[PDB]
Amino acid sequence: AAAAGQVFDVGPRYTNLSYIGEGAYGMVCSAYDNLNKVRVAIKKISPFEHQTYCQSTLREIKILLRFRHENIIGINDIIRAPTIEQMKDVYIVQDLMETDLYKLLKTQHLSNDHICYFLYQILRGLKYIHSANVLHRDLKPSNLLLNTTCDLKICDFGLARVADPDHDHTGFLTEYVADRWYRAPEIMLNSKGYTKSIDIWSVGCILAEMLSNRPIFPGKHYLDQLNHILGILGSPSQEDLNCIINLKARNYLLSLPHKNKVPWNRLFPNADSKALDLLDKMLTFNPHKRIEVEQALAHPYLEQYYDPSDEPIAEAPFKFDMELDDLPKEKLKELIFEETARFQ
């Protein structure tokens, strides 16, 4: 059993392992694919102890196996034991991507052309995801992979859900998992994040972060996240408040001192004015007024790339809720076993 740091048993076919990160349920290595003669990425996942780990792992696998898109990371192979009894770990083999936008923004200035092309690819992948009735719900720079030729692939569908706008409403201050800094204001107010508009907010946050190499709304906690948003957008309008019927959320917003909108050109004086027009439309407080993915693709900022015939949609949308919250981990291990069978 070949070792890294732990068992990383991808054995004969996958060799010359190099540690390139850790994280959720396992650890990530690069490896030489002795069959296909390319370096690949391998994610070891060890989730079968914890129901919640098994949910995230089954979601990621089910979604990434169904999706086929140039801007979404695919699964090339899956390594696991031939029996459920022997299966402790699952190895997911993917295209090796040189970096992610998080690592890139820590150290590199992006040209206006790079910002434009990266946003185009994010929205092109997102159009496919949304067309499949799926919400990503955790878009952030670390979940956007890039290779040496600036090809961008969305990854990490662990928090992804089938869209359910009918059942989106909830109380004030309802608990949430996805990264605070990329959470739409309605999450803190009255939304479960079951509508496509929560992904467009996250893209808007990522566009702002590409324009300055700093998170635009770096809240330290839940209400601080809302003060950061309202610090730039200003106090919500009467019309936007009238949309918030939940009294705890409405009265919280009414309690706050009046704030005027800060103009995007003050925050980003060297930005392309078309980029700031699109940023404004993505970071709209009211999710009903917020631009949709297909409208963002058609925005003048993206006119060099925009080609709706080359912006494919999903053949096989997820019609129905993935009924995973109440499956015991033993059922979820069986589903993961069945979902991975095609690679044996």
Ligand X SMILES: Nc1ncnc2c1ncn2[C@@H]1O[C@H](COP(=O)(O)OP(=O)(O)NP(=O)(O)O)[C@@H](O)[C@H]1O
Give the nearest residue (CB) to ligand X: 21
Comparing CA positions, the residue from 141, 42, 45 lying closest to residue 99 is 141
Question: Does the annotation place 4 within a ligand binding site?
Answer: no
**Cα(327)–Cα(59) distance, integer angstroms:** 13
Distance of CA 1 to the CA centre of its chain: 33
Question: Does the annotation place 27 within a ligand binding site?
Answer: yes
Q: Do 25 and 54 contact (CB within 8 A), yes or no?
A: no
The smaller minimum CB distance to ligand X, of residues 99 and 286, is found at 99
**Cα(280)–Cα(289) distance, integer angstroms:** 11
The smaller minimum CB distance to ligand X, of residues 80 and 228, is found at 80
Q: How far is the CB of 27 from ligand X (least distance, A)?
A: 8
The smaller minimum CB distance to ligand X, of residues 94 and 202, is found at 94
The smaller minimum CB distance to ligand X, of residues 96 and 276, is found at 96
Which residue type does 328 have? Answer: P
Helices (H) and strands (E) in the chain, counts: 12, 10
Report the interface residues with ligand X, using CB under 6 A: 20-21, 23-24, 28, 41, 73, 94-97, 100, 142-143, 145, 155-156, 158
The smaller minimum CB distance to ligand X, of residues 158 and 193, is found at 158
Q: How far is the CB of 334 from ligand X (least distance, A)?
A: 22
Three-class SS state of 287: coil
Structure tokens given for 291 = 């631009």
Question: Does the annotation place 21 within a ligand binding site?
Answer: yes
Question: Does the annotation place 26 within a ligand binding site?
Answer: yes
Q: How far is the CB of 215 from ligand X (least distance, A)?
A: 17
Catalytic member of 33, 77, 100, 138: 138
Q: Do 167 and 190 contact (CB within 8 A), yes or no?
A: no
Three-class SS state of 38: strand
Residue 343 buriedness (CB in 10 A; 0-12 / 13-18 / 19+) = middle
Residue 229 buriedness (CB in 10 A; 0-12 / 13-18 / 19+) = buried
Q: 138 catalytic, yes or no?
A: yes
Q: How far is the CB of 37 from ligand X (least distance, A)?
A: 17
How many residues can be counted in the chain?
344
In DSSP terms, 42 is beta-bridged to: 29, 93
Question: Does the annotation place 128 within a ligand binding site?
Answer: no
Which residue type does 199 have? Answer: D
Question: Does the annotation place 87 within a ligand binding site?
Answer: no
Half-sphere exposure of 4 (CA within 13 A, CB side): 22
Annotated binding-site members for ATP: 20-28, 43
Annotated binding-site members: 20-28, 43
- Which residues are tagged catalytic? 138
